[PDB]
From a paper:
[name] is a 180 kDa heavily N-linked glycosylated type 1 transmembrane protein with two homologous catalytic domains residing at the N- and C-terminal ends ([name]-N and [name]-C) in its extracellular region. Soluble [name] has two homologous catalytic domains: sACE-N (amino acids 1–615) and sACE-C (amino acids 616–1202).
Chameleon preparation reduced the time the sample spends on the grid before freezing by more than 10-fold. However, while the core region showed excellent map quality, the map quality for the dynamic regions corresponding to the open-close transition of [name] catalytic domains was poor, suggesting multiple discrete conformational states exist. We thus performed 3D classification and reconstructed three distinct conformational states of full-length apo-[name] at resolutions of 2.99 Å, 3.05 Å, and 3.15 Å. We refer to these [name] dimer structures by their resolutions, namely sACE-2.99, sACE-3.05, and sACE-3.15, along with the structure from data obtained using the Vitrobot, sACE-3.65. Based on the openness of the catalytic chamber, defined as the distance between the D1/3 a and D2/4 helices that gate access, we classified sACE-N into three conformational states: open (O), intermediate open (I), and closed (C); sACE-C is significantly less open than sACE-N in our structures and is only classified into intermediate (I) and closed (C) states. Our sACE-2.99 and sACE-3.65 structures are globally similar, both contain sACE-N domains in the open and intermediate states and sACE-C domains in the closed and intermediate states. When sACE-2.99 B/A chains are aligned with sACE-3.05 A/B chains, three domains are well-aligned, and the remaining one depicts the open-closed transition of sACE catalytic domain.
Numbering used by the authors:
A (entry chain A): 121 to 1163
B (entry chain B): 469 to 518
C (entry chain B): 1164 to 1200
Write the structure that this text describes.
Amino acid sequence: IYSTAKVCLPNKTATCWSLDPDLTNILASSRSYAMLLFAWEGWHNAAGIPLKPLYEDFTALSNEAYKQDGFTDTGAYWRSWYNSPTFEDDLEHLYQQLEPLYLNLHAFVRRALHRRYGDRYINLRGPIPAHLLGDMWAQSWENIYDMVVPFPDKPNLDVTSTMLQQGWNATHMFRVAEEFFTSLELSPMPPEFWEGSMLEKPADGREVVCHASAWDFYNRKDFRIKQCTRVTMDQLSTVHHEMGHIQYYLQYKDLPVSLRRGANPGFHEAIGDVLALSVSTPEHLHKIGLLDRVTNDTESDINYLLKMALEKIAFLPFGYLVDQWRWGVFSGRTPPSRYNFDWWYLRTKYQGICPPVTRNETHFDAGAKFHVPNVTPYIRYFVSFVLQFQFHEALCKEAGYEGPLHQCDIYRSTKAGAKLRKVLQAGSSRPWQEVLKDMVGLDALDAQPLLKYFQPVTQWLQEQNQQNGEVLGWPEYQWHPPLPDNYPEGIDLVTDEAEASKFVEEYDRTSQVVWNEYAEANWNYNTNITTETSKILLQKNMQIANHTLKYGTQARKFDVNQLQNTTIKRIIKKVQDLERAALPAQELEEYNKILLDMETTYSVATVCHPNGSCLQLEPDLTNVMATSRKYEDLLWAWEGWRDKAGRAILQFYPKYVELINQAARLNGYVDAGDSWRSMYETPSLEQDLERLFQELQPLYLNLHAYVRRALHRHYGAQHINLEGPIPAHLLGNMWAQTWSNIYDLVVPFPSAPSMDTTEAMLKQGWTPRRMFKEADDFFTSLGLLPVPPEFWNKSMLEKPTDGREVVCHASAWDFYNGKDFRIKQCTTVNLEDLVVAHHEMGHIQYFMQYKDLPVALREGANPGFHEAIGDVLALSVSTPKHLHSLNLLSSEGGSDEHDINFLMKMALDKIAFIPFSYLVDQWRWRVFDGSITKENYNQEWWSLRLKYQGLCPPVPRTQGDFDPGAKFHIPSSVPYIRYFVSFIIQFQFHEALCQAAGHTGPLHKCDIYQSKEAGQRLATAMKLGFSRPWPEAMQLITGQPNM
Amino acid sequence: KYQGICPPVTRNETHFDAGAKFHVPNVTPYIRYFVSFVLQFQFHEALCKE
Amino acid sequence: SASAMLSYFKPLLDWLRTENELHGEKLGWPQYNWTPN
Ligand SMILES: *[C@@H]1O[C@H](CO)[C@@H](O[C@@H]2O[C@H](CO)[C@@H](O)[C@H](O)[C@H]2NC(C)=O)[C@H](O)[C@H]1NC(C)=O
Ligand SMILES: *[C@@H]1O[C@H](CO)[C@@H](O[C@@H]2O[C@H](CO)[C@@H](O)[C@H](O)[C@H]2NC(C)=O)[C@H](O)[C@H]1NC(C)=O
Ligand SMILES: *[C@@H]1O[C@H](CO)[C@@H](O[C@@H]2O[C@H](CO)[C@@H](O)[C@H](O)[C@H]2NC(C)=O)[C@H](O)[C@H]1NC(C)=O
Ligand SMILES: *[C@@H]1O[C@H](CO)[C@@H](O[C@@H]2O[C@H](CO)[C@@H](O)[C@H](O)[C@H]2NC(C)=O)[C@H](O)[C@H]1NC(C)=O
Ligand SMILES: *[C@@H]1O[C@H](CO)[C@@H](O)[C@H](O)[C@H]1NC(C)=O
Ligand SMILES: *[C@@H]1O[C@H](CO)[C@@H](O)[C@H](O)[C@H]1NC(C)=O
């Protein structure tokens, strides 16, 4: 049952793991907590549950057999081999002596495991979960030595090259072992060993595992160690160990056959291990000749001693624990109902190990160990590990070696071998106490030589634990690690830190180049709209979609919750979702086609006069809206544009909503409004925005009332009444987002002092290049670094060279390479042109500030942060003082009349835009989650238009007119709440920078110029980019974390 | 193991729950009560038999 | 469950659908911005 047991995964129950070939490799090499725990629980259940009744029956039968034999117990018979009436008390004293070393080692390893696995599955005052260590039974901790190596810079000792350098093979190893033995007056080894034994089998059958075997044919001339000798340091040590076994056999092979097998079970392993440890010393290795040069340092010594400690000290509690439980079971002190209770009591008490899952009496965790079913005593290994160091210390004292005990050797110390032979020849004739007294002078087992051997490692461990302030031992003995989330089915997830770092490095490397190529292609298509450029842009779009799908699917195998970091965790979280790439191939093609169709039918739309003339939006329809003061012309333009664009887009919009909702659901979000609101990482974004708007409402209401009064003064009373909304087209935009920015109708009081920003630009020689240069100069003077020089001669800002100039409106471009910061906008020359220029230079400087960041975080702290940072300086520049400094004349605050006029002009923008921005994006959110159906798209749009804004449709509308489709951002499918958020927080940033500028006064006219402290404060928070959540950067800029 | 009861709240090595019993600080042996409870019924059965 | 309510009026729903199809009436009110005065 032990041999045939296997653990199989919950699914795909075709073939499944066994212990020795499979389970050992995963439980030694893997570092996934879920996988390690799955293997541990599966193996222990599988091998333990069906072994309990058999063990109870065997216990009863064996006890009865040996009671008939004379012993009171089976455990009494097992203890009778050592013939010590107080064996248990001696073992308890030995473990109490070895306790401090194990406590220091246990605390150190627990600290390392807590660093690796985090303070939720492992706490620093408590036991270590059983599976986390190297072994399945926590027996030895070698496989954990990767995270525990002390000062790993010094390479570990090995002569792996030297056996290939000079011919060693296999026969010579036994020759050097034999001559080393003869260098101690130990008896020579008979010729039957040489050719009669086995060392390597070319084709004579399929050899056994042959890890270790020494044979003692009872005829006084036959001795074999089948080993399958290799050429390795540990192979040489095992050669010496097995030859020590054989030397024991040969030297004590004089007494009768009954008086054999050594003084007690545990003398043979000790005798072999003494020579095995004394041979691996560097000094003896050098004296043999396998180590050419003898370097020296305490670091390699500490490394070797810690590896030895992990091998042996980690085992000693287990060896004592296994037999203690079996003695308790055999004696009857543990009925077949406290098997697991007493087993885990012992495991926690002696080893400090905690079960990873809750166990109870249906389980048999002792049956998972090999020696419990295949009934074999276990305390021989404990006794041998103690005796080996006792013997070694005694031999080195007799050998005359002075110094550290672990570096001692007995080579060419024949004087020390005489007493070794004297003890060895005894065999089982005398009680082992007398033999030990002969060898060392002590009667019983002692742990003093063991502690003396491990003195340097234990001193280093004590110093490290005291420095780290760890508590030795495990208080909170009740603590048990929590079950991992979705444990039974989430086991095949990579949670390794090195793997995540490799993935993030590879993703950054490939994404940098693919996105740089995409930036080049986008620039070329932007400035060179043609057929070949469009085709190359489309092929690059397909390439980027395939790359994003591949790397997102790769990152979806990771477990972002179990990673212990911030940067890589953020990167994996960001790349884990697929930007519309989660859709199936047919769905993705349809989604791209519908997006392109909506963008196209919005871009090429034109409204034609009855006489035949046709007008596009961007060149003249916007102008015929901004400059005309005739009700019929405005109504014709408004209605015609809304009709054409909206009725074109309405045919496609419902399908687009369904597809984007499907993609955002496949990405783990809900209904594609959550996907858009998750850019701000605030779960309560909607409430915050509503509160901000409610704060802003009274000022907008006052401005709306004043503008309505002025418009009634102009247009009369038939078209506008003083109680009620204003028609949506009498304001100055096709959408009334920035209404009456053309404010000649609403100017508060037209005083004689009045600047002409639009006319001053034409009057002066303000070329676009020179004003862009002036913006750069002001940006530099603020305290921020300039743009690289090639930006001026590499970017275009004047005019196109193709059939279509550009799309209606776009933004700045970054190439992710740390060198290209191109700009695209060109709108002749105007005041609005100056402010848009300053906005785009702010955008470029934001793009350039985080060049040192990884590509995945090369995105900006918040979607609205980009616009806010770009526009705070533009807000500062538009002041009357800074406009006075630059080709204009303005009295600034000297004339309060002109100040009120400037404030009104600056308020007709940035107010009446806040309601519109929130309005359009809010409408979209309600459409995306099904609150607004296809039937009442227009109804709900105009309800929001009347509620938040104060506008009414100039002409009656019907279902079937898609007015929201006249905006550019609705068919282009770009979020809009970024503009509301940016308009809200750019004034916060202006206030903070003015406060840092050293003066406050009239904030509405305060300007930042040569204020290096404010620029530095802005730079220290613009540079984090997306690496940290938005509130941190907002607090760094301002102090108040929230909007 | 013997009584079959659990602590209502989690304990650790900081606590000393054995000292809450009167006999532990006021050092007095306690197995005399177990022995007497076992013995009194033996005496009763023997007397009833006789 | 609203299914029993729909089953109660199923003959009427069928006849109403037939009559509306014959008269060519558009369900709903796709002139929502309409008031009598
Ligand atoms: C392993 O190789 C060793 C040498 O590396 C072989 O033993 C030696 O063979 C050479 C042949 O030139 C002799 O001169 C030596 O006397 C041999 N003995 C020693 C101790 O060096 C050996 O035969 C090889 N063994 C196997 C099993 O293939
Ligand atoms: C390497 O240096 C160590 C000391 O760092 C040497 O240890 C000395 O060992 C000799 C006997 O071999 C003692 O007499 C000295 O007292 C030891 N020194 C200390 C500081 O304990 C060691 O022998 C050197 N060589 C090797 C090969 O390890
Ligand atoms: C864990 O995150 C930290 C930062 O929070 C990383 O530290 C730096 O990470 C960057 C980006 O990978 C590297 O360029 C630096 O070399 C890292 N610095 C140091 C001192 O290590 C850290 O690398 C992350 N851990 C892993 C395993 O990637
Ligand atoms: C033993 O457990 C007690 C009770 O849980 C611990 O005392 C609490 O410790 C936590 C962690 O510091 C504090 O937040 C609580 O306020 C403590 N409660 C009280 C009543 O003091 C105690 O720290 C644990 N001791 C050890 C050695 O692990
Ligand atoms: C734009 O494309 C045309 C194709 O005729 C080519 O001649 C021209 O050089 C291109 N311009 C740039 C700046 O690449
Ligand atoms: C994207 O990769 C898939 C992998 O199967 C490939 O079949 C497909 O052709 C690729 N797409 C394009 C547009 O080349």
